[PDB]
Amino acid sequence: PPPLQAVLVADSFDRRFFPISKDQPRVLLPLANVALIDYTLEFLTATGVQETFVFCCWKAAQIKEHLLKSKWCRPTSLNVVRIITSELYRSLGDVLRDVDAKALVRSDFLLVYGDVISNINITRALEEHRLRRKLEKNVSVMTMIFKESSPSHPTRCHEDNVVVAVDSTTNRVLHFQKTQGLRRFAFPLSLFQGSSDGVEVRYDLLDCHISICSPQVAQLFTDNFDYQTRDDFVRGLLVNEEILGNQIHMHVTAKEYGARVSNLHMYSAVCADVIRRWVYPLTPEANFTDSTTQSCTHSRHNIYRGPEVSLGHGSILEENVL
Amino acid sequence: MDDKELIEYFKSQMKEDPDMASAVAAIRTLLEFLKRDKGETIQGLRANLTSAIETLCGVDSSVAVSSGGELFLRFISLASLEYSDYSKCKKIMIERGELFLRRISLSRNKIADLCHTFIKDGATILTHAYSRVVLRVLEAAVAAKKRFSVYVTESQPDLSGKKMAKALCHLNVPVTVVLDAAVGYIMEKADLVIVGAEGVVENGGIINKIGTNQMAVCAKAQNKPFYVVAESFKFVRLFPLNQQDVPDKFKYKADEEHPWVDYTAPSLITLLFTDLGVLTPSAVSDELIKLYL
């Protein structure tokens, strides 16, 4: 059982937090008075990750000088960050070409975007994915991680849903598709040609990017410059399935949270969410990052309180007020 | 020191600073008296101290005085004496009494630092009288930036509740003086009721100002947890069982009428506060037989 690498981008290439991103990048935004990089790193620490090859492309000096105030910088914690600042790479295709060039990862690197909020214990899905590998000659590639939700949860800014046809018996993906405007849903019958035993379309799924990977993901990306996002990677892999098909695999867990604040609205959602304990352990007063500027004392209706508040006479704190 | 110097010194100790409990003044006056020895014989000394306690209670029969004086006699002669000369012994006794009075001076602030962790945010404290202990614990609760309101009952005979309301709005805390009869009305909106004992018998109850029993039994009716603060020089040795079982030497205090102080059983009390810590009223029995030795 080799170690568990985990690459980690540190700014979305399509920058959506404009204009506010110009001051500081998203991965330095205060989600609940905490840096999103701290959330995702606490997550990788929870899963069991030893190394987080944090890649940076923008404001990387600020990110470096802040992440050196972490708990992962010092060798106390096991999850040893290894920052990498650059400006030559511009996309996640470019990130993974960078990886295969530097020849870093052995296998199974938890490709995880910058501001993923979650508490997922991937070790189950990861075990099943490594099983798929060890059993069928490393054909399976990107065992993604999806989470159930209803389509109307405020955590779904319509710009970010998904539609995915999966072969529910081996739970592999047969067709991925965004839906940022398609009031219809197209499907090539070849998926049923591929599904000689019963496909299943799903739309309740919600994406988390926590996708597992392989050295094969890099060996793929290095061939095709045209890639610009892991989604285009999915589509390209889903059209050229003639030789060494490398079928993606969906994998879903129910009890845990997951997201990626990639606008102001989904940020409002995940903030008013993590305030309501929805993601425990990674709550706001457990102070997983043990910085004394963020201690807090629970109360009725989750009205938190940090040191030296001194509320005035009559301030009716109703709920969720960090 | 034929006991008129005694009482005049006690009244001086009173009017110099009225706020403090009568009993700490009693112990201070007994200590000063002990300094005015005129004779080193252990026996005639403790007989003198007992006569002194008697002539003290003859003017301030508040259970405080007797409890404190008896505890004083208990703690003076704790260690050995080997009175081969009886004068160095009296030096040791003055020293030990001074240590005792230091512990009594630390009582209040110990109460303050142990208790105010119990007034949760946004509550409505209820009290009954000018319990300087409750005043200082309330101060050490507000100055910790807690938030609450406070009701107080005027306690008709001497309107002590009103004086406390004055000295509490002087602390800028929202305070309302409700009639003493209305302890049932308010008992539902006020979360917990704090009151300051002036006597803590063996079973665990208290012997406090007239309007306490009804308050305890109401705040046990509507299940509002009770709390009584009581410092370690008010651990009496009585044991009433009814109202008629508090001796007349404690009730009227005067020398178709009214009593002054009365009982409250250790079931109507949830947690007692001493500078020995926080106790459940059975701890009163254990720690009292262990304190009186």
UniProtKB/Swiss-Prot annotation, chain A:
**Domain of life per record:** Eukaryota
Q: Where is this cross-link: Glycyl lysine isopeptide (Lys-Gly) (interchain with G-Cter in ubiquitin)?
A: K22, K64, K102, K178
Consult the record and explain the modifications the protein receives after translation: Phosphorylated on serine and threonine residues by GSK3B; phosphorylation inhibits its function. Polyubiquitinated, probably by NEDD4.
Signal peptide start and end residues:
none
User: What does the UniProt record say this protein does?
Assistant: Acts as a component of the translation initiation factor 2B (eIF2B) complex, which catalyzes the exchange of GDP for GTP on eukaryotic initiation factor 2 (eIF2) gamma subunit. Its guanine nucleotide exchange factor activity is repressed when bound to eIF2 complex phosphorylated on the alpha subunit, thereby limiting the amount of methionyl-initiator methionine tRNA available to the ribosome and consequently global translation is repressed.
| Oligomer status and interactors | Component of the translation initiation factor 2B (eIF2B) complex which is a heterodecamer of two sets of five different subunits: alpha, beta, gamma, delta and epsilon. Subunits alpha, beta and delta comprise a regulatory subcomplex and subunits epsilon and gamma comprise a catalytic subcomplex. Within the complex, the hexameric regulatory complex resides at the center, with the two heterodimeric catalytic subcomplexes bound on opposite sides.
Q: What protein am I looking at?
A: Translation initiation factor eIF2B subunit epsilon
User: Lineage in the entry?
Assistant: Eukaryota, Metazoa, Chordata, Craniata, Vertebrata
- Encoding gene (name): EIF2B5
Q: Which residues of the full protein are shown?
A: 40 to 361 of 721
Swiss-Prot record, chain B:
Question: Main localisation, per the record?
Answer: cytoplasm
Residues found modified as N6-acetyllysine: K35
**What's in the keyword line of the UniProt record?**
Acetylation, Cytoplasm, Disease variant, Initiation factor, Leukodystrophy, Protein biosynthesis
The GO cellular component terms are:
cytoplasm; cytosol; eukaryotic translation initiation factor 2B complex; membrane; plasma membrane
How its function is modulated: the record gives: Activated by the chemical integrated stress response (ISR) inhibitor ISRIB which stimulates guanine nucleotide exchange factor activity for both phosphorylated and unphosphorylated eIF2.
Q: Where in the cell is it found?
A: Cytoplasm, Cytosol
A Gene Ontology molecular-function term? guanyl-nucleotide exchange factor activity
Signal sequence region: none
Give the disulfide map: none
Gene Ontology terms describing biological process:
cytoplasmic translational initiation; oligodendrocyte development; response to glucose; response to heat; response to peptide hormone; T cell receptor signaling pathway; translational initiation
PANTHER family in the record, alphabetically? TRANSLATION INITIATION FACTOR EIF-2B SUBUNIT ALPHA
Q: Which disease appears in this protein's record?
A: Leukoencephalopathy with vanishing white matter 1: An autosomal recessive brain disease characterized by neurological features including progressive cerebellar ataxia, spasticity, and cognitive deficits. Brain imaging shows abnormal white matter that vanishes over time and is replaced by cerebrospinal fluid. Disease severity ranges from fatal infantile forms to adult forms without neurological deterioration. The disease is progressive with, in most individuals, additional episodes of rapid deterioration following febrile infections or minor head trauma.
Concerning its family, UniProt says:
Belongs to the eIF-2B alpha/beta/delta subunits family.
Q: What does this protein do?
A: Acts as a component of the translation initiation factor 2B (eIF2B) complex, which catalyzes the exchange of GDP for GTP on eukaryotic initiation factor 2 (eIF2) gamma subunit. Its guanine nucleotide exchange factor activity is repressed when bound to eIF2 complex phosphorylated on the alpha subunit, thereby limiting the amount of methionyl-initiator methionine tRNA available to the ribosome and consequently global translation is repressed.
- Fill in the subunit field for this protein: Component of the translation initiation factor 2B (eIF2B) complex which is a heterodecamer of two sets of five different subunits: alpha, beta, gamma, delta and epsilon. Subunits alpha, beta and delta comprise a regulatory subcomplex and subunits epsilon and gamma comprise a catalytic subcomplex. Within the complex, the hexameric regulatory complex resides at the center, with the two heterodimeric catalytic subcomplexes bound on opposite sides.
Q: What is this protein called?
A: Translation initiation factor eIF2B subunit alpha
**What's the source species' lineage?**
Eukaryota, Metazoa, Chordata, Craniata, Vertebrata
